[PDB]
Design brief:
Length: about 900
């Protein structure tokens, strides 16, 4: 075969139309199938990308010679690129993986994967001198080994994809060949987009059918999911909008359910041409659809373009087997869809009517895009730093700009709303979607707010008038006032500026005031900044983090003492209405700036649905604002916004009386050793959730858990909870807590049979009916514990235990420090073992360890030193 060499082609410019041509429907595929009558060479010039979608066509078929020698030159001559489509798994190996099936020639190694990528491009692109490669990423094409999805092949395919992108596409050695990805997945479910996106020219999304258009439906929340907008936004993270193309499907002959998309017109007996009409079809909606932000899309594509013109069979209606007949297409749908996009307002070119100043016009086209549709949508930064710009006329056409930077524009004299973006002030989105929505959603959300453009002004040395009045600007940041040396008239009134003393805003205003006054002729019309309504925000930090209070019979409001206040975005704190009026009466050059109608409750934030969490030193937890001080206790207090209930906005330590150390739950995350309780729910006893009704029931009616403290310490308290308010009179009514006495029976390899067989010590026997029980404990230092609970119900009582807490202080080998001390008075209440005056030099050291251990401020290093030096006085 002699393959002709590449034909000069005019560059691709959107809007683009693409088509997947099924090879088995080309005349030359199987000469025996006389019904196969179409030809890929017959595709019209309106088709920019003809995709070779291969199946059923034999390796030896004369189609491949026809493609390379006739079709490609014919299509290239008219500007149509011919793209080879291959499935995802061709990049992975394993089942049905094309070239990659030869795992010995192309091993899964760094050099083997480099070789596979070169082989893939040589075989599927260069062999017939095609114009690019399209990798199809869907479940249909996922890497598989023995009919099983292969995570290993998926990982390999990521590597091979990058290697291909170094050969072709925008980052490749041969930039004259397109590297294209199509996918059914949302971007977060596309395993290859994050690494593959820099290497591709175009991204195609298959969104066939009403569910591609509207998204799926969330049955519970009754909302659309994976909408066209949400799909684009997921990929906007990775590609530009002009790289984005969306796909519909023609009606494939003899299609099953699950392959019926209704993307083109349903047949009608009384109009045999209705399949070639496009108005109102999903296909035309896709042609007209545009993202709401970012920019205009790259175009659209069709699957099965050889079926162009065939009407779709009716959903509910008697069969029409005539639609399954194979007829030669005239590609009328494809021609009309291309013309719909080419004639759309969105793809109108930005010209002199929009920006008369060519220097400005060239800056917008370079940065925003050449199409008028981008003015409506562009979402990033427009930097204007060419000093040749003599006019900003046309900037009002930018509707969604995130940042406008005006730098060094010497010859601009005035700035107001006529030469500024339309979103300098609050605006709502005005673009209307052309897509059908869910009838079962009633979705007409009113016109999302457009975030306002951030404005930077630096070096406009000829700027004489700066009018930003009535735009609800949040700050003046970005205004390099010292550089605006020709200002004569400034209006910043009717915004949201905190212009208080010490703010950054005030300094920019004061710098401009100096400039304007030095010019002279200052009147009441010349420098106006009043009617400000600055937004009141929640303070980031609060002033009170520690409070020592005396023991007294009184209740305090913790929220009133610790959490209040409102700040502006410049840091001006207001406590109360009294403080606010002082702020409201501030003056700049003898003139108040805060709007007089903007009262305190309009400005102040509220702490209505803020929650409080108060934990004492024994880890008892309440959510009460009011705290008694009659009892001597040390508390941790945390406040939670309703917006985040896991994560406090403010924390404070309140000491009542002498300070006590905050204890810890040493049984938190304890490992289950033994007992008869259900192992899954037994673990949930120590996870940390006091309302852990993930079914915390341990057995039928009487349960036991043997557990090991993950890192033992000094135990002084314990607590357990019955199912919080979910049940009553099913409560645990009897409980016994036991500690193991450091006597592992010479079988440390087993440690379960040993504990279920030794003699323990009972640290507490609970009998009662409280929802929650807590109790002090006598400095136990055991690593191994057993809890036994009983709700006194029938043998099918299904006793439950949401949490158990073993509470104390972290101190490794606390077992030793109580073994030694226990013997310290098994030796000092009996005289004359070593007894001399040494006995009272013992007793001063035993009285100092019981004092060190039983101290409210637990200091581990103090006890060690007291423990270590009592240890020294035994051998002597
Ligand atoms: C390429 C590849 O890979 N392939 C693969 C595949 O894949 C797949 C595919 O797909 C396709 C499809 O598609 C669809 O669509 C869709 C798409 O997909 C997507 N995409 C896009 C963008 O969008 C989306 O969606 C869409 C829609 O949905 C569709 O289109 C379809 O179509 C169909 O359907 C429709 C409706 O619906 C219609 O309309 C159409 O038309 C169609 O239909 C069809 O048609 C056809 C035509 O005709 C038919 O056919 C059949 O055929 C047969 C044949 O046969 C024979 C033989 O074979 O032998 C012949 C002879 O002649 C005879 N003889 C005498 C007569 O004497 C014989 C007989 O039978 C005797 O008797 C014996 O007994 O035979 C027959 O004829 C029958 O009958 C017929 O029927 C059919 O049927 C129809 N169907 C219906 C249902 O209707 C389409 O289809 O593709 C893609 C891309 O590419 C992918 O992704 C997917 O996934 O898959 C499969 C499964 O698995 C496979 O298969 C297999 O294969 C094997 C072989 O292979 C291989 C290995 O070896 O592995 C592969 C690799 O790669 C390669 N390479 C390398 C390694 O390198 C290889 C080579 O070639 C060498 O050889 C080796 O070395 O290969 C085996 O065969 C087995 O068996 C199987 O299973 C495949 O592969
Ligand atoms: Ca729990």
């Amino acid at each position: 075969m002699k393959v002709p060499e590449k034909i000069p082609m005019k560059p691709l410019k959107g809007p683009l139309y693409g088509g997947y041509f099924r090879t088995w429907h080309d005349k030359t595929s199987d000469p025996a199938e006389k019904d196969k009558v179409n030809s890929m060479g017959e595709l019209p010039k309106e088709v920019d990308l003809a995709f070779v979608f291969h199946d059923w066509t034999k390796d030896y078929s004369l189609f491949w010679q026809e493609l390379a020698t006739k079709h490609v030159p014919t299509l290239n001559k008219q500007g149509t690129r011919v793209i080879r489509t291959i499935p995802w798994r061709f990049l992975a190996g394993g089942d049905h993986s094309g070239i990659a099936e030869d795992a010995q020639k192309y091993p899964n190694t760094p050099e083997g994967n480099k070789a596979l990528a070169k082989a893939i491009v040589d075989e599927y692109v260069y062999k017939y001198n095609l114009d690019g490669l399209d990798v199809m990423i869907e479940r249909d094409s996922i890497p598989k080994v023995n009919k099983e999805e292969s995570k290993e092949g998926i990982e390999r395919s990521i590597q091979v994809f990058e290697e291909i992108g170094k050969l072709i596409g925008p980052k490749g050695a041969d930039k004259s060949r397109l590297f294209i990805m199509d996918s059914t997945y949302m971007a977060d479910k596309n395993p290859l987009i994050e690494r593959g996106a820099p290497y591709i020219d175009l991204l195609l999304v298959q969104v066939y059918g009403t569910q591609g258009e509207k998204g799926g439906f969330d049955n519970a929340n009754h909302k659309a999911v994976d909408t066209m907008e949400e799909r684009w936004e997921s990929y906007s993270k990775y590609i530009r909008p002009e790289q984005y193309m969306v796909g519909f499907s023609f009606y494939e002959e003899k299609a099953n359910s699950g392959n019926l998309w209704y993307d083109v017109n349903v047949e009608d007996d009384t109009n045999p041409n209705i399949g070639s009409e496009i108005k109102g079809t999903r296909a035309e909606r896709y042609a007209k659809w545009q993202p709401k932000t970012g920019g205009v899309k790259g175009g659209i594509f069709s699957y099965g373009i050889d079926r162009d013109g065939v009407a779709h069979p009716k959903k509910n209606g008697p069969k029409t087997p005539d639609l399954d007949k194979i007829v030669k297409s005239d590609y009328k749908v494809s021609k009309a869809l291309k013309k719909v996009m080419e004639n759309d307002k969105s793809y109108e070119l930005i010209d002199q009517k929009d920006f008369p100043d060519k220097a400005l016009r060239e800056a917008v086209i370079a940065q925003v895009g050449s199409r008028r549709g981008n003015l409506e949508r562009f979402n990033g930064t427009l930097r204007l730093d060419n000093p040749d710009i003599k006019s900003l006329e046309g900037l009002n056409k930018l509707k969604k700009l995130a940042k406008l930077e005006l730098i060094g524009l010497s010859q601009i004299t005035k700035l107001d709303s006529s030469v500024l973006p339309e979103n300098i002030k609050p605006t709502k989105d005005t673009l209307v979607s052309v897509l059908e929505t869910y009838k079962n959603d009633d979705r007409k959300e009113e016109a999302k707010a457009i975030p306002q453009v951030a404005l930077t002004i630096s070096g406009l040395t000829g700027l004489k008038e700066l009018n930003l009045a009535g735009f609800d600007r949040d700050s003046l940041a970005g205004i390099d006032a010292a550089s605006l040396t020709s200002l004569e008239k400034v209006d910043l009134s009717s915004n949201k500026l905190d212009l208080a003393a010490g703010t950054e805003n005030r300094q920019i205003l004061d710098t401009m005031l100096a400039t304007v006054t030095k010019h002279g002729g200052v009147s009441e019309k010349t420098f106006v900044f009043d009617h400000q309504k600055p937004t009141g925000l929640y303070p980031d930090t609060y002033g009170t983090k520690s409070l020592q209070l005396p023991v007294a019979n009184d209740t305090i409001d913790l929220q009133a003492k610790l959490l209040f206040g409102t700040v502006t975005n410049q840091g001006t704190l207001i406590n109360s209405e009294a403080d606010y009026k002082a702020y409201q009466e501030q003056e700049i050059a003898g003139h108040r700036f805060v709007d007089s109608s903007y009262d305190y409750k309009a400005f102040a934030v509220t702490y209505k649905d803020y929650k409080i969490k108060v934990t004492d030193s024994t880890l008892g937890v309440t959510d009460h604002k009011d705290l008694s001080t009659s009892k001597e206790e040390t508390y941790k207090v945390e406040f939670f916004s309703p917006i985040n209930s896991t994560k406090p906005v403010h924390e404070a330590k309140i000491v009542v009386g002498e300070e006590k150390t905050m204890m810890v739950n040493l049984a938190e995350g304890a490992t289950i050793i033994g007992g008869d309780a259900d192992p899954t729910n037994a673990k949930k006893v120590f996870d940390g959730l006091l309302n852990n009704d993930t079914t915390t029931l341990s057995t039928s009616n009487k349960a036991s858990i043997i557990f090991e403290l993950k890192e033992p310490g000094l135990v002084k308290h314990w607590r357990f909870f019955n199912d919080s308010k979910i049940s009553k009179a099913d409560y645990i009514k009897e409980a016994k807590l036991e500690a193991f006495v450091g006597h592992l029976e010479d079988s440390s390899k087993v440690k379960d049979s040993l504990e279920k067989s030794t003699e323990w010590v009972t640290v507490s026997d609970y009998s009662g009916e409280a929802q929650e029980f807590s109790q002090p404990l006598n400095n136990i230092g055991a690593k191994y514990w057993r809890i036994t609970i009983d709700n006194k119900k029938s043998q099918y009582g299904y006793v439950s235990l949401p949490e158990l807490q073993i509470i104390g202080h972290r101190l490794p080998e606390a077992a030793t420090v109580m073994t030694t001390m226990a013997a310290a008075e098994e030796l000092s209440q009996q005289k004359d073992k070593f007894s001399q005056e040494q006995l009272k030099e013992l007793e001063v050291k035993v009285a100092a360890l019981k004092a060190a251990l039983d101290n409210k401020m637990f200091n581990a290093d103090t006890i060690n030193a007291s423990f270590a030096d009592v240890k020294a006085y035994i051998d002597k």
